[PDB]
Amino acid sequence: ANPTTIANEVNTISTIGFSSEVVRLNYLKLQYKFRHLKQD
Amino acid sequence: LFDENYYAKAVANIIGEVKDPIMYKWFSPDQIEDVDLQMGYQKTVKWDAFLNANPTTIANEVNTISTIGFSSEVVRLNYLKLQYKFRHLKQTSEKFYTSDSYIGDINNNLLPFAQAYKLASSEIIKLINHFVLTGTVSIQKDGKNQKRLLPNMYGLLNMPEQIKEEVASGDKDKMDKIFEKIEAGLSKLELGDEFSTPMMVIVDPATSLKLVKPYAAASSCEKWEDVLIQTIKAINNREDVYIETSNLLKHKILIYPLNSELIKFKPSKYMLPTPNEQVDKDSTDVAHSYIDFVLGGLLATRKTILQVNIKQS
Amino acid sequence: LFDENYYAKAVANIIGEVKDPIMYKWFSPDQIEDVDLQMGYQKTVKWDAFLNANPTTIANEVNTISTIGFSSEVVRLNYLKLQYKFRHLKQTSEKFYTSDSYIGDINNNLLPFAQAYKLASSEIIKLINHFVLTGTVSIQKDGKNQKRLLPNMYGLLNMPEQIKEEVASGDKDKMDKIFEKIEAGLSKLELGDEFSTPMMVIVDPATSLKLVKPYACEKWEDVLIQTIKAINNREDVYIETSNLLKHKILIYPLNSELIKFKPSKYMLPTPNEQVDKDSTDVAHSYIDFVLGGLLATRKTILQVNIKQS
Amino acid sequence: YSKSMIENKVFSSCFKSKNERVDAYSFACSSYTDKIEEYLYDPANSFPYKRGVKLVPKENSIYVEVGADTDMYGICVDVCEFSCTAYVLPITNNFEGYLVTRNPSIKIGEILDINNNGVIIKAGGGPPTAINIYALSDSFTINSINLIKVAIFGNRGLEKT
Amino acid sequence: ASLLDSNFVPINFTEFVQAISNTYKQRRIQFYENLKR
Lengths: 40, 313, 309, 161, 37
What we know:
This is part of a larger assembly, with 3 copies of chain A, 1 copy of chain D and 1 copy of chain E. By secondary structure, chain A is mostly loops. Chain A contains no helices and 2 strands. Chain D has no helices and 11 strands. Chain D has a 5-stranded mixed beta barrel with strand order 1-3-2-4-5. In chain D, strands 6, 9, 10 and 11 form a 4-stranded antiparallel beta sheet that branches. A two-stranded antiparallel ribbon of chain D has the order 7-8. In chain D, a hairpin with a 4-residue loop joins β4 and β5. Chain E is about 60% helix and about 0% strand. Classes of the chains: A little secondary structure, D mainly beta, E mainly alpha. The interface of B and D includes residues 80, 144 and 147 of B. β1 of chain A pairs antiparallel with β2 (about 70-90) of chain B. The entry lists the keywords Portal, capsid, scaffold, viral protein.
């Protein structure tokens, strides 16, 4: 909210909020199969 | 005090990690002078002198001599105090929320007092910079729901009795028309006897991007920025010209001299965020803290600020 | 303590600027004895002795001797605790309100803690003096909206089992009738063997104005003083005027054996340790005081009320 | 008008009946844990000091304007004219103090209602009262403005007549 | 009387606030000293 002007008596004051974000990175495993000649 | 006030100790320890405000780049070092006040008004008196008649030649015996008269003017400035509140974790309760990589309650958005204070101070300094630049206080991108301020509290963009130019909507992309308006405003500028001073121009990112195009058939080895610098040097007695880009501005160009004799900033010594002694406590692990900051204190001579607004609608 | 409690330091520094209560002029130095009690009741036991028969002559051998008996009387006195709250500026904020030759907000009627405490203490002392003189607690000129008080909490004007005289509304301007009622009350007064003692009379401004009128080259005040000297073994007679009284005349001796004030040693205003604080520059403070403790023997106070309607 | 209201040539002349001042402390009996809020008020429409106020959300800020009991948000107990800021005790909190009235002859114990101007009047005017207001003292005139000590405790269940 | 000096020890909250203000002023002065347009 907008700031509170401190004059005379007041106890209801605008607040500052906080938040937390969680960043996740995914790693995936993949495989290929190929044919060849045994040790055309 | 530090043996009894953990919050004060933490504020002293972490105060150095808060970056300096960006408004310091818009003024010369001599232009800023702190004042001792929190809320109220302060008066400044300027004295001037004038000659009443032609000089009197001193020869033989003379009793009547030409005189020099005097005059004064008074300027009143207003300062306002504002406060924010923020919740955080109790000092003795941090160990129960410590983690392997961080400290705090993610699920409930609870932070240590030091980090919460640092973030709140950063936000407050951003707001203070916005207020100093624009003359208004708001938390919305639309610019509405503005907080009502006291009279004699103005910014660089809303200072009365300055030169204002408006580039039409149809000419929003015509750099030639923008420069025509800028030249008209510069001609309308009245610096008096303090013209030999460096000048400062602040532009929006779009205007800054437009200023780097080749000068216009397009011309080589010269840019619109160079043309503007030459135009400003034509009036500032070939003094330095500085150009800045601010994301706070929007389709606005602000030109003003960096001379303390014309424009001065006398902010309160408590303008920057300052913690409050009162801390709310209870039987739980959540505490509350307060931050104070003071706004106001910009003085400028009339007809010394040029504000060019490019219309979109 | 003073290194931590600025409010206590200021109270200690400015406690000497509060004027003494005016109720001290209505009592002798020996009549006042402080007690240690904040709120509650205290029982005072008075012992007396008497002779059972004529004394026995000691001659030759004798074993039967006259005896001296003893008696006791218990009197219960109630003491009440009352509080007031006042707002004041904060110590860390006084520097921003220290103006030229004065401190505080004229517009907001905010004062430094020391001055605020001094003024509040003066007002509370005035209220205590009014309660001591009259026996009632009120803040209105009409004397209404009175705070209900506990039993065994009496002042000089409302003490029971004393001589009460009433002057009729038709005789409100007849000083001869008023003095006749005063003489009747003085005759009904009973001092016993403690008659040789100074006397104190308290009158309203109207009665004071009427007293200086010529007696009907002698004054009504002089005649009253002579009459009181006739009964008090010609001791001192003191006359006082109080604006807290209205058409009332109080006459009583200044002997500690008949009337005694045993006030609490916390009766006068005392600061409270609790101070309300917040994020603003305004703080609240509390002042405590104690009421009650007047004791008088039966039929030793003359109270004359002049009815107006 | 204003609250402070001026240089004097001479000073103005017991402890009783010294509270009859327009700028007196509004709360006859105060209490910590009383909630006080700050709002803006119109500096040219109506002076809200010691009057019942309502919330008017404007296009630039939320203001407080003098209002009736039907749409009352609270009681304005103090004003800072330098910042044109009104301090409001919400109707959810109790109040016992002096408020502005327009009837110079009101007795003690009478039922009262707040009118459209945020002014205490007798509840017999006809509008159905929705708030519990009682006169704790007779109305007194300061020479001219009429004030009265009142106790306000919450809303009334069923509107009276 | 600034928070930069580790030898400085505040006694009360007023001194702490004065130290904060002095630190802010010193930081601004240092920024202007180190600034090169």
